[PDB]
Design an enzyme around this catalytic site. Structure first.
Site, short mmCIF file in Angstrom:
data_model
loop_
_atom_site.label_atom_id
_atom_site.label_comp_id
_atom_site.label_asym_id
_atom_site.label_seq_id
_atom_site.Cartn_x
_atom_site.Cartn_y
_atom_site.Cartn_z
N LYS A 21 0.80 -1.22 0.00
CA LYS A 21 0.00 0.00 0.00
C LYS A 21 0.83 1.27 0.00
O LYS A 21 0.51 2.23 0.71
CB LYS A 21 -0.96 0.01 1.19
CG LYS A 21 -2.03 -1.06 1.10
CD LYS A 21 -3.30 -0.68 1.84
CE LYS A 21 -4.40 -1.72 1.60
NZ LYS A 21 -5.73 -1.31 2.16
N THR A 30 10.15 -2.70 -23.19
CA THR A 30 11.01 -2.19 -22.13
C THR A 30 11.08 -3.19 -20.99
O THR A 30 12.12 -3.37 -20.36
CB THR A 30 10.47 -0.88 -21.55
OG1 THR A 30 9.20 -1.13 -20.94
CG2 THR A 30 10.33 0.17 -22.65
N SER A 36 2.42 4.62 3.39
CA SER A 36 1.30 5.51 3.67
C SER A 36 1.20 5.64 5.19
O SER A 36 0.58 6.57 5.70
CB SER A 36 0.01 4.91 3.10
OG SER A 36 0.12 4.72 1.70
N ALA A 39 -27.48 26.02 -1.04
CA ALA A 39 -28.34 26.74 -0.10
C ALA A 39 -27.73 26.86 1.27
O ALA A 39 -27.75 27.92 1.89
CB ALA A 39 -29.70 26.05 0.00
CE CE Z 1 -28.84 22.00 -2.66
#
Ligand code: CE
Ligand code: CE
EC number: 3.4.21.-
Length: 691
Positions: A73, A117, A259, A467
Site C-alpha cells: 500500500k 522495455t 502511507s 443553499a
Molecule cells: Ce442544494
C-alpha cells in the site's frame, strides 16, 4: 540530529554506486542526508519499504500500481517532471517506433518481432498489450495474457518475462547467460534505451517506448529520420509528432513511500534540495538526472528536469488516472467481465442509510445497478475518479468540485414546475428551473432580520453546498471580505467542518451522539431536513435551506418526533432587504436561485448511465410502474437518500453538459472566489492531476 537520513532503495549495483555518490555529494553541500539500500528488483524495493528497511524508490506507472496493492500500500509522493522548463509536464507518451521502409501499421503487427522495455511497464507493456488486446484472440484467465502475446509476435524481448513458460517472449533478448531476459541493466535490451537498441540492431520490427527515447539516444536529425511512429489510426508519422501519434498519454514515474509513516517530509525536502544543488545542469560534480556512459536511468529518468510534489489525498489509483488504472486491471480479466462492468452502473452512496436504499434498488435493477459507498461526498467522488464507482446525484456545490475533477453532469433532478403541470408526462424534457435558497427563522424571534443575522447561531445543510453554504457564506463574504468563515456566526452546525471548530458545536451526530458533524445522514442535522431540524429544535436561530424544506416538515407533512407538530406559520424567511415574509412568499424573498442537483459521472459512462437511469425511473419513478408496489427511487421518508424525495424525474440537460455551463458563469465565479479562502484535499488533488 534525530533524522539519520532517508533510506533509498536501489535495484542494481550501478544504481547503488550512483546512490552512494549522491550520499556524499549531499553532506558535502551540508544538505539533508541520504543512505542507500541494495536489492535485486523493484518489488524487492517495494517490500523493503513496506517493512521499513527502506524509505523511497521511484517506479514506473506499472509498478506504482503494484506498489499500491496490499500489503505494501505504498503511495506516490513525488512525480518526475519531463519536457522542458519552458513547458514542464508530469506525464509522457507511450509510442510504437518502427524504421522507415516497412509499410505495416499498428493493426498489422501479427507475426512480427517486438521490443518491450519490460514486463508490467507502462509504455513497454501495459499500454501496447492493452491496445493490441482485440488482435490477441486471448480467451482470458486463467490463461496468462502472456501466452497470447507469445503467439501473436513471431518473437520478442520482454525483460522480466518467464523464459521457461514464454521462451518466445525472450527469444530476441540479447542478455548473456542467465541474464537473458533479465529485468535489469544486465539485459542490454532493458528499459527504454534497451528496447530502442533492440530496434536499431534489427532484432525487432517494433519497439514500445516513450516519446523522448529517439531524441535521447540519437543525436542527429539525420538518424532520427530513419524512424517513424505507428499511430492508433493505423498510419505512420514522424517521431516528433508524438503529440498527435501516441498509444496513450501516461503519468510520469514517481517516487513512492509508505502511507503509514513514510517520512514524506524527509523525502520531499531531500528531493527539493537535491534538485537545486545537483539538478538539471546544476553541479558538474554529481548529476541527479544523468548517468555514466554505459548506464541509463539510474534511480531517476535521465534528462528529467525535477520533481513535483504529490498532494496528500492522492493514492496510486488516483495518481494513475481512471483510464490507465482500469486498463491495467483489465489485463487480468476476460472480455466478458470487462464488457459486463462497462454495462453496469456502480452508484456510490454516502453513509449506511443511502447504502441500504442503494442495495434495495440494486436487487430490483436486474443487474444494471450495483453499489459502492464512502462516508463523505468527496470520497465518493474519489471512488468515481478511480473507476470503483460510476455515478451519484450531487448538490450544485458538489457538481463544482466534481467538475474541477473532470466529471460531468448527465441528468438533473427535476422538481415541480413554477406552477401546476399535473404529474407532467414530459418531465424528462422539461428544462429545470432551479430551486429557492432561503434563510428560515422562527416566527417568534421578531427582531431577527438579515442585517442582524451575523453573530447568531446558524444551521447549514453542509459545507460546500449551495443553499446551506455557498450562497449564505458568499453573500456575507462579499460584505466583509473576511475568510474567517468560522466567525461569521457565534456557533453552528455545518456538517463537514472541523469538529473542534465552532462550526460544529451545534451538531449532534446520531442517536448515540457519534459522528458529530460528519457530512452524511448519520449526523441528524445534516442536509436540508437536518438543517431545518437544527432550527426547529432551537439549536440555531437561522437555517440555510430551500423553501420546500419547511413545507415538507411542517403541518403533519412529516410525522416524526421533532417535527410532528411544527406548523408552517411558526416560521419566516429573511429577505435581503430586511423584510420578513412567510415561507409561502419565498418567490419574492430568497437569497438566490440554486441550480438543481444533477447526476454526475465520467465521460465514458454518460451514454450507458443515461439509458439505465431512464429505464430505471420509468420503473421506479414518480409515476413509475413498480412504485409504490415494489420500490420508489425518489422516496426515503423525508431522508432525501440518493436523490431528493421531491424529485419528479431525472431530466436532460439541454446542452448544459459541463459543470461550467450547468452551474452557470456567475455561480461558478462566486464559488471560485469562495475557494480562495481555502480548498479541500480533493480539489488540491484534482488540480494536480489536471495540469
Ligand atoms: Ce442544494
Ligand atoms: Ce515508464
Amino acid at each position: 540530529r534525530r533524522r539519520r537520513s532517508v533510506q533509498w532503495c536501489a535495484v542494481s549495483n550501478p544504481e547503488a554506486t550512483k546512490c552512494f555518490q549522491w550520499q556524499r555529494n549531499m553532506r558535502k553541500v551540508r544538505g539533508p542526508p541520504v543512505s542507500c539500500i541494495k536489492r535485486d528488483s523493484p518489488i524487492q524495493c517495494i517490500q523493503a519499504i513496506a517493512e521499513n528497511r527502506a524509505d523511497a524508490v521511484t517506479l514506473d506507472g506499472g509498478f506504482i500500481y503494484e506498489a499500491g496493492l496490499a500489503p505494501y500500500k505504498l503511495r506516490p509522493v513525488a512525480a518526475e517532471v519531463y519536457g522542458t522548463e519552458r513547458q514542464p509536464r508530469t506525464h509522457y507518451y507511450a509510442v510504437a517506433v518502427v524504421k522507415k521502409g516497412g509499410s505495416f501499421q499498428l493493426n498489422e503487427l501479427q507475426g512480427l518481432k517486438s521490443c518491450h522495455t519490460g514486463l508490467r511497464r507502462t509504455a513497454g507493456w501495459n499500454v501496447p498489450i492493452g491496445t493490441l488486446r482485440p488482435f490477441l484472440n486471448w480467451t482470458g484467465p486463467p490463461e496468462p495474457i502472456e501466452a497470447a502475446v507469445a503467439r501473436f509476435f513471431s518473437a520478442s524481448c520482454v525483460p522480466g518475462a518467464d523464459k521457461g513458460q514464454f521462451p518466445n517472449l525472450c527469444r530476441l533478448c540479447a542478455g548473456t547467460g542467465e541474464n537473458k531476459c533479465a529485468f535489469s541493466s544486465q539485459e542490454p535490451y532493458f528499459s527504454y534505451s534497451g528496447a530502442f537498441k533492440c530496434l536499431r540492431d534489427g532484432a525487432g520490427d517494433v519497439a514500445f517506448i516513450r516519446e523522448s527515447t529517439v531524441f535521447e539516444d540519437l543525436s542527429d536529425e539525420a538518424e532520427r529520420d530513419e524512424y517513424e511512429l505507428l499511430c492508433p489510426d493505423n498510419t505512420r508519422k514522424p517521431v516528433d509528432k508524438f503529440k498527435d501519434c501516441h498509444l496513450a498519454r501516461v503519468p510520469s514515474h514517481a517516487v513512492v513511500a509508505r502511507s503509514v509513516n513514510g517520512k514524506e517530509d524527509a523525502i520531499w525536502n531531500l528531493l527539493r534540495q537535491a534538485q537545486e544543488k545537483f539538478g538539471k545542469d546544476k553541479s558538474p560534480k554529481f548529476q541527479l538526472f544523468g548517468s555514466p556512459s554505459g548506464q541509463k536511468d539510474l534511480l531517476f529518468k535521465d534528462s528529467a528536469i525535477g520533481f513535483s510534489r504529490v498532494p496528500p489525498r492522492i493514492d496510486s489509483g488516483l495518481y494513475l488516472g481512471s483510464g490507465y488504472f482500469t486498463a491495467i486491471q483489465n489485463l487480468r480479466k476476460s472480455e466478458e467481465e470487462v464488457a459486463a462492468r462497462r454495462a453496469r452502473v456502480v452508484w456510490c452512496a454516502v453513509g449506511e442509510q443511502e447504502l441500504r436504499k442503494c442495495n434495495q434498488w440494486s436487487g430490483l435493477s436486474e443487474g444494471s445497478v450495483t453499489c459502492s459507498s464512502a462516508s463523505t461526498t468527496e470520497d465518493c467522488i474519489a471512488l468515481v475518479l478511480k473507476g470503483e464507482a460510476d455515478a451519484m446525484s450531487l448538490d450544485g456545490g458538489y457538481v463544482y468540485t466534481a467538475g474541477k475533477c473532470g466529471l460531468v453532469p448527465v441528468l438533473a433532478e427535476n422538481y415541480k414546475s413554477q406552477q401546476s403541470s399535473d404529474p407532467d408526462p414530459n418531465c424528462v424534457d422539461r428544462p429545470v428551473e432551479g430551486y429557492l435558497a432561503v434563510a428560515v427563522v422562527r416566527r417568534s424571534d421578531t427582531s431577527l432580520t438579515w442585517n442582524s443575522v451575523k453573530g447568531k447561531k446558524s444551521c447549514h445543510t453542509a459545507v460546500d453546498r449551495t443553499a446551506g453554504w455557498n450562497i449564505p457564506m458568499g453573500l456575507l463574504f462579499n460584505q466583509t471580505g473576511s475568510c474567517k468563515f468560522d466567525e461569521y456566526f457565534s456557533q453552528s452546525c455545518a456538517p463537514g467542518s472541523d469538529p473542534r471548530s465552532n462550526l460544529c458545536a451545534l451538531c449532534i451526530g446520531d442517536e448515540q451522539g457519534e459522528n458529530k458533524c460528519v457530512p452524511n445522514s448519520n449526523e441528524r442535522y445534516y442536509g436540508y431536513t437536518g438543517a431545518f431540524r437544527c432550527l426547529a429544535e432551537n439549536a440555531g436561530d437561522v437555517a440555510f435551506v430551500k423553501d420546500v424544506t419547511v413545507l415538507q416538515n411542517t403541518d403533519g407533512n412529516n410525522n416524526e418526533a421533532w417535527a410532528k407538530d411544527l406548523k408552517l406559520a411558526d416560521f419566516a424567511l429573511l429577505c435581503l432587504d430586511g423584510k420578513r415574509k412567510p415561507v409561502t412568499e419565498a418567490r419574492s424573498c430568497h437569497l438566490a436561485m440554486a441550480p438543481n442537483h444533477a447526476v454526475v459521472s465520467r465521460m465514458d459512462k454518460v451514454e450507458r448511465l443515461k439509458q439505465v437511469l431512464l429505464h430505471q425511473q420509468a420503473k421506479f419513478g414518480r409515476n413509475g410502474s413498480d412504485c409504490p408496489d415494489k420500490f420508489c427511487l425518489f422516496q426515503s421518508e423525508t431522508k432525501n437518500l440518493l436523490f431528493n424525495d421531491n424529485t419528479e424525474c431525472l431530466a436532460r440537460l439541454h446542452g448544459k453538459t459541463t459543470y461550467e455551463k450547468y452551474l452557470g458563469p456567475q455561480y461558478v465565479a462566486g464559488i471560485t472566489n469562495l475557494k480562495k479562502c481555502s480548498t479541500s484535499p480533493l480539489l488540491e488533488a484534482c488540480e494536480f492531476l489536471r495540469k
